[PDB]
Every structure is written in C-alpha cells, then in structure tokens.
Amino acid sequence: DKHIEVIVRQMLRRVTIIDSGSTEFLPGSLIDRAEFEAENRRVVAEGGEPAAGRPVLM
Amino acid sequence: DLAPKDLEKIIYFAAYVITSVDEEMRHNELSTLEAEMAVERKAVEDQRDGELEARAQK
Amino acid sequence: AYTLQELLTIKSDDTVGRVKVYEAIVKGENIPEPGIPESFKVLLKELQSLCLNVEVLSS
Amino acid sequence: LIVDENLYRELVDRYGEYFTGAMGAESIQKLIENFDIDAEAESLRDVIRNGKGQKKLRALKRLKVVAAFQQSGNSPMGMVLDAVPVIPPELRPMVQLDGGRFATSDLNDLYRRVI
C-alpha cells in the first residue's frame, strides 16, 4: 500500500481558496496547505482577517 | 492599463496616441483658452452671418 | 548519483573531460571530477539570445 | 486615441503646444520610463482595501504585476529593445550540399531579412 500512499499524499495536497480578503493571491487559486497556513497565521497574528480556504484534490 | 487593441494599434501603426500632457499650464489659462475659443467661434460666426446676409439679400 | 553524473557528463559531452579522463586512465592518476556538459552551456548561450539574461549566481 | 488622421493633424496645427503624440514604439518607452511604479502600487492597494469585487479582481491582478515589478529590483524599460543579439554560427549550421545550397534552419534567412 505505501507505494500508493506516497502518490496519493502528493495528489491531494492543495487548498483551493474562495476569497482572498486580506491576502494578495487571486481567489480561486490553488495554494499548498503549508504556505496557505503560514500566510494565514502570519496575517492573523498581526490582526489581519484569515483567508477562507478548503482542501481539494486534482 | 491599456487594452490589447490600443497597444497593438500603437505598435502596428493605425492611430496616434497622446503620450504626456502638462495639464497644469493649460489649466492656468483654461479660461483664456475658452475666451479665445469664444472669439474665434465669433469670427467664424461673423463670416457666416456675412455670407448668409449677402446670399439672402441676393 | 556519481555513476549518473559520469554517464551524463564525462562520457558523452565534456570534451576536456573526455581528454583528461583518457589521459589519467593511460597513466596511474585518479579520474578528475567531470566538468560542465556541452548541453548546458549550449542551452545558456542559446537562451541568452532571447534577451533573457540568465545569470549563474555562484554565490 | 485618435482614429482619424485629419483630427490629429488639425490638433497639432492648431494646439501643438502641451501634448506630444507619436504612433510607434519609442512612445511606449518614454511613457513607461516617465511612469512610476510605487504610486500606482499604493493606489491599487488602497482600492483593494475597499470592496467592489468586479473592479477589485482587476485591481488585484494589476497590483500583482506591479508588485512583481517592484520586488524584481529591475525596470520595465527592458520590454523595448534596441540591440537584438545573434546566436553563434554552429548553432545555426551552414550546410553546403553538392550544389552548395543552404538547407538548415532558416534563422539565417530571418537574420538576413532583419539586417
């Protein structure tokens, strides 16, 4: 199975975003989970509203 | 911030374009420009009236 | 990794690499490390022709 | 823009003082070099701070491009060329057949046309 897990882990590692709000990137643009989380925590820590995004595969 | 039509026209030769404008110096005599506009329109009106009166009399 | 490096650089493209390795083998000296393949240098000298200044940033 | 040349001719003959207008590439170079990036970036950021999604998306895209320009540390003037280069000869090989006719990639013909 792990030979398949190593693939499906890469396949579903994108977070589509519906609104940018206090973020520069265009709404509806794929962003990996790590960078999206980093920018979200950065903007929230400074008081900026968070960006609403959800995970999605392709 | 120029549409592809305008940009390709400016590059492919079909219509002129005003690059820069020193709007202030025209504003500083916008009223004087209006006055000379009015008096030159008055001159063309005067020649028009002369022609009309002459032809109506004829 | 090193085997792939040899197969891609020292036995196919690099001219000075080929000459130096042949001389070293003829003598008892160790094989010197490969150099820059001709393919990459050609790619540079071709991409620099499209006004795309392709730097190296050795730093 | 001024579509008809007669109107432009009349303007330049009558009022040819304040506005300078030419059709062709140098115009763009002068406009961009005279243009500034930071002020437009600030204006677009202020617009983004507001709503109105319709124009807000265009503002976002334009701000993205302008911020890329600003961060690059370069200038837009690289989009108007004045000296095109030519690749080395072997990369455009000259083949001499039995009759000597050139048959490889026409890069040579394109350079001939340009020169």
Side-chain angles (χ1 to χ4, degrees):
Chain A
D1 290 0
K2 71 175 71 67
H3 293 338
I4 306 182
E5 288 290 3
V6 171
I7 292 171
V8 304
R9 180 180 182 275
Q10 300 297 320
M11 192 166 64
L12 193 162
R13 197 180 62 174
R14 296 297 183 181
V15 187
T16 182
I17 299 172
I18 179 57
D19 77 325
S20 292
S22 62
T23 60
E24 61 185 358
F25 45 72
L26 151 69
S29 299
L30 308 173
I31 302 293
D32 56 354
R33 197 171 300 181
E35 308 176 10
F36 165 81
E37 179 184 0
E39 188 173 357
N40 192 21
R41 63 182 179 193
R42 189 193 72 87
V43 64
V44 171
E46 61 183 349
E49 62 187 7
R54 52 172 295 278
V56 64
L57 67 85
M58 294 193 303
Chain B
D1 58 74
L2 259 184
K5 289 70 154 163
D6 300 2
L7 186 60
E8 71 190 2
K9 277 181 167 294
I10 299 155
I11 281 315
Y12 283 141
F13 292 75
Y16 300 89
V17 160
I18 291 73
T19 65
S20 62
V21 59
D22 190 329
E23 186 65 10
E24 169 53 22
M25 181 57 191
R26 203 280 305 285
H27 182 74
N28 296 118
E29 296 300 341
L30 253 175
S31 184
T32 309
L33 283 165
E34 184 178 358
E36 58 79 16
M37 177 77 186
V39 303
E40 64 85 6
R41 273 180 295 178
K42 176 69 73 173
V44 304
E45 163 273 359
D46 184 6
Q47 56 80 17
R48 171 266 281 183
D49 164 66
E51 291 190 359
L52 263 77
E53 295 293 353
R55 295 293 182 276
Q57 180 278 339
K58 287 178 183 63
Chain C
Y2 288 110
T3 297
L4 189 65
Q5 187 196 34
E6 285 186 9
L7 296 184
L8 292 181
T9 71
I10 200 173
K11 294 196 291 183
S12 176
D13 303 333
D14 192 359
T15 68
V16 61
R18 291 176 307 184
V19 177
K20 296 294 182 185
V21 66
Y22 181 86
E23 294 294 350
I25 295 173
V26 168
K27 287 179 287 299
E29 191 177 5
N30 302 322
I31 287 70
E33 66 283 2
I36 297 173
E38 291 293 351
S39 180
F40 163 82
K41 194 179 181 185
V42 163
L43 194 65
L44 247 64
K45 294 295 181 183
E46 189 280 344
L47 194 52
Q48 295 185 6
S49 166
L50 278 170
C51 308
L52 309 177
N53 175 23
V54 179
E55 306 182 14
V56 180
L57 286 186
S58 58
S59 302
Chain D
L1 275 72
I2 298 177
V3 184
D4 55 352
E5 84 303 350
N6 68 338
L7 189 138
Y8 184 87
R9 177 183 298 95
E10 185 59 25
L11 266 306
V12 62
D13 292 326
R14 200 75 59 81
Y15 311 148
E17 44 175 355
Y18 295 118
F19 77 92
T20 60
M23 56 197 301
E26 71 281 5
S27 313
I28 281 173
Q29 182 177 253
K30 181 177 60 166
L31 178 51
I32 62 183
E33 63 86 5
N34 177 27
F35 186 70
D36 187 357
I37 64 184
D38 59 2
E40 190 181 24
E42 298 296 348
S43 68
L44 270 291
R45 293 162 184 273
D46 301 2
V47 168
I48 293 305
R49 188 163 292 96
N50 205 330
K52 301 174 299 312
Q54 198 288 331
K55 186 168 64 60
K56 191 174 177 176
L57 60 100
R58 297 178 56 183
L60 288 170
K61 297 178 290 184
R62 281 169 34 71
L63 181 63
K64 170 174 64 178
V65 176
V66 175
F69 270 90
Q70 180 273 358
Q71 179 273 357
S72 69
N74 320 326
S75 298
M77 280 75 78
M79 304 198 160
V80 291
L81 279 292
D82 297 327
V84 307
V86 314
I87 57 177
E90 290 188 345
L91 285 298
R92 55 181 200 280
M94 57 185 181
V95 70
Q96 312 307 331
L97 281 61
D98 53 359
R101 296 294 303 276
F102 155 85
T104 54
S105 65
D106 71 305
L107 279 293
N108 303 31
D109 183 71
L110 308 178
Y111 285 116
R112 286 185 63 191
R113 287 190 181 184
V114 168
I115 300 159

